[PDB]
Amino acid sequence: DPVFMRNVKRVLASYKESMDHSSRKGMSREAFVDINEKGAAWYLGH
Amino acid sequence: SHARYRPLSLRARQTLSEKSDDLQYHVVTQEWFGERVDSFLTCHYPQWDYETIKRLVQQGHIYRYRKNGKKKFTRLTDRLEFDELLVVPTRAFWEKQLAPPSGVLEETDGPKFKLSATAREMAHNMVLFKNEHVIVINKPHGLPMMPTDDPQEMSIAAMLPAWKFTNVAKPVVCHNLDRETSGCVVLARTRNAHRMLGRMFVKRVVPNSVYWSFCVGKPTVNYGRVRMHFDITRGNKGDIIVARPSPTKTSKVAIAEFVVNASALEFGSFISFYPLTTRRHQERIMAAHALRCPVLGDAKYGGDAAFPSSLSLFWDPENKGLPLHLHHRKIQLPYKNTAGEFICVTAPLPTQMEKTFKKLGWPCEVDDPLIPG
């Protein structure tokens, strides 16, 4: 094992899901969620 | 105008009762010695209703003094003792920052609204269940429950004088719905009936109503519970609703148990909500954000997502004016039928919901067993 390719293969085998695209979610969190001093919260309204 | 009343604790109310000299002391002489308190008060105040007298006596605004150095609070059935005093507040006692019960002051009706023949006909048509104490109507989509900011719009509060079939006073709405929500609405015919049914619409632990909804997309779970914490803030021309997973002092919880009855593969779902709280747009918010499935036609929460192109063969996604697919289906009542079961009133599905159900091949009129009778 001259070069750490086992870790490369391990991290490449885990490509089943992408964080940019959702398969069964009609609503998005990046459009309503924002963190405040108390935590995360959904802000509904323009 | 009641604009001078202030929040008072029991200590402050007792202190104001002690300070204010706007009191009348009826001396119990030999002629009234031995009578009942309610009888004495009914004979001495002909302008007061028995409900008003009962509220005053039971809340303690009217009391008696037996020359002991302390005030004596009694029941309506207690007898009067000789040479004692009966302390009753006067009219000027309620002009300070202490609000009286509802029967003390006198309200004025003033104007009386006029309903046309067609309005009365449709009001009679919307009736689902009638009883000696309650009337359940089928409010449709797009009809406001109360007069909005524009006074020129019709409303159920304005159609209310049409459901006094034989009574003298119009009924009183027990719970309000959104402008887009359509379904069963409860109207108490008696004042006592309203006071007793108000307990049924506060936050509870066991649900007694159903909401049938058609949501865009199928959630990852078939059944479960939804719990959010809503904070309402005043905006420019609306209300900013902040939904949180953790409670705050200025927030209020919204809880509902949802069950996905039937659904398309991953494009649409039919969900039954059973709420335990009463929060603004509760079902719509919990569907759009907790279940991540916006209700079909819910343009306020997930506007572009509420008009999917998957149903373009049935609903044109370009008008964006189709009714909200959320219907107050079934509600249980404390009154029992002849068979011994609680009366459960059910409202038929609206036109758009029945059309969607028929296009997807689902039966429209099915009894929901999760709310027993």
B266 touches chain A (CB under 8 A): yes
Edge-to-edge strand order for the sheet containing B23-27? Answer: B23-27, B85-89, B63-65, B71-72
Give the CB-side neighbour count of residue B326, counting CA atoms within 13 A. 27
Q: Say what the resolution is, in angstroms.
A: 3.1
Residues sharing a CB contact under 8 Å with residue B134, sequence separation 6 or more, in sequence order: B186, B187, B188, B189, B193, B197, B333, B335
Q: Do B246 and A38 touch (CB under 8 A)?
A: yes
Rounded-to-integer distance, Cα B234 and Cα B218, Å: 33
Give the CB-side neighbour count of residue B4, counting CA atoms within 13 A. 8
Which residues on chain B are in Cβ contact (under 8 Å) with A38? 244, 246, 248
SS3 assignment, position A6:
helix
| Cβ neighbourhood burial of B248 (10 Å; 0-12, 13-18, 19+) | middle
Which residues on chain B are in Cβ contact (under 8 Å) with A45? 235, 238-241
Which of B171, B164, B213 has its CA nearest to residue B328? B213
Residues sharing a CB contact under 8 Å with residue B147, sequence separation 6 or more, in sequence order: B153, B155, B157, B158
Residues sharing a CB contact under 8 Å with residue B64, sequence separation 6 or more, in sequence order: B37, B71, B72, B74, B80, B84, B85, B86, B87
SS3 assignment, position A35:
strand
Which of B278, B102, B283 has its CA nearest to residue B194? B102
Amino acid at B331: I
Which residues on chain A are in Cβ contact (under 8 Å) with B235? 45
Q: Which token pair is B277?
A: 């709280």
* Among chain B residues, CA nearest to A30: B289
Rounded-to-integer distance, Cα B116 and Cα B36, Å: 50
> How near does any CA of chain A get to the CA of B237, in Å?
10
Q: Distance from CA of residue B161 to its chain's centroid? A: 18
Cβ-contact B19, B12 below 8 angstroms = no
Which residues on chain A are in Cβ contact (under 8 Å) with B286? none
A19 touches chain B (CB under 8 A): no
B295 touches chain A (CB under 8 A): no
A11 φ/ψ angles, rounded to the nearest 5 degrees: -75, -25
Q: Provide the pairing of β-strand B134-139 with B182-188.
A: antiparallel
B236 touches chain A (CB under 8 A): no
Q: Do A41 and B242 touch (CB under 8 A)?
A: yes
Q: Do A42 and B244 touch (CB under 8 A)?
A: yes
> How near does any CA of chain B get to the CA of A13, in Å?
25
Which of B134, B260, B234, B243 has its CA nearest to residue B192? B134
| Other beta carbons within 10 Å of B269 | 23
B288 φ/ψ angles, rounded to the nearest 5 degrees: -75, -35
Rounded-to-integer distance, Cα B194 and Cα B79, Å: 32
Give the CB-side neighbour count of residue B309, counting CA atoms within 13 A. 2
Question: For chain B, how long is the longest CA-to-CA vector?
Answer: 88
Q: Do B292 and A26 touch (CB under 8 A)?
A: yes
B172: β partners:
B188
Consecutive H or E run containing A44? strand A40-44
Q: What is the CA radius of gyration of chain B?
A: 26
B331 φ/ψ angles, rounded to the nearest 5 degrees: -140, 135
Length of chain A measured in residues: 46
Rounded-to-integer distance, Cα B164 and Cα B115, Å: 13
Q: Provide the pairing of β-strand B23-27 with B85-89.
A: antiparallel
**Which of A17, A24, A29 to probe by mutation at the B interface, max B CB count within 10 Å?**
A24
To the nearest 10°, the Cα dihedral for B312, B316, B320, B326?
A: -60
Cβ-contact B182, B295 below 8 angstroms = no
* Among chain A residues, CA nearest to B301: A44
Write the secondary structure of chain B as one string of H (helix), E (strand) and C (coil).
CCCCCCCCCHHHHHHHHHHCCCEEEEECCCCCCCCEHHHHHHHHCCCCCHHHHHHHHHHCCCEEECCCCCEECCCCCCECCCCCEEEEECHHHHHCCCCCCCCCCCCCCCCCCCCCHHHHHHHHHCEEEECCCEEEEEECCCCCCCCCCCCCCCCHHHHHHHCCCCCCCCCEECCCCCCCCEEEEEEECCHHHHHHHHHHHCCCCCCCEEEEEEEECCCCCCEEEEEEEEEEEECCCCEEEEEECCCCCCCEEEEEEEEEEEECCCCEEEEEEEECCCCCCHHHHHHHHHCCCCECCCCCCCCHHHCCHHHCCCCCCCCCCCCCCEEEEEEEEEEECCCCCEEEEECCCCHHHHHHHHHHCCCCCCCCCCCCC
**With b meaning 16 or more CB within 10 Å and e meaning fewer, what string describes B174-205?**
bbebbbbbbbbbbbbbbeebbeebeebeeeee
Alpha helix positions (H), chain A: 6-13
> How near does any CA of chain A get to the CA of B357, in Å?
21
Which of B269, B332, B267, B370 has its CA nearest to residue B136? B332
Look-up of token digits 């037996």: B66
> ∠ CA(B99), CA(B103), CA(B106), 5° rounding?
85
Q: Do B294 and A26 touch (CB under 8 A)?
A: yes
A33 touches chain B (CB under 8 A): no
Length of chain B measured in residues: 373
SS3 assignment, position A39:
coil
Which residues on chain B are in Cβ contact (under 8 Å) with A43? 240, 242
B294 touches chain A (CB under 8 A): yes
A27 touches chain B (CB under 8 A): yes
Cβ-contact B85, B25 below 8 angstroms = yes
> How near does any CA of chain B get to the CA of A15, in Å?
21
* Among chain B residues, CA nearest to A23: B266
Q: Provide the pairing of β-strand B209-216 with B326-336.
A: antiparallel
Q: Distance from CA of residue A2 to its chain's centroid? A: 33
| Cβ neighbourhood burial of A27 (10 Å; 0-12, 13-18, 19+) | buried
B354 φ/ψ angles, rounded to the nearest 5 degrees: -65, -40
Cβ-contact B210, B272 below 8 angstroms = yes
> ∠ CA(A34), CA(B260), CA(B282), 5° rounding?
45
Q: Which token pair is B125?
A: 């048509």
Rounded-to-integer distance, Cα B332 and Cα B344, Å: 4
Rounded-to-integer distance, Cα B143 and Cα B155, Å: 6
For chain A, report the end-to-end CA distance as a whole number of angstroms.
Answer: 57
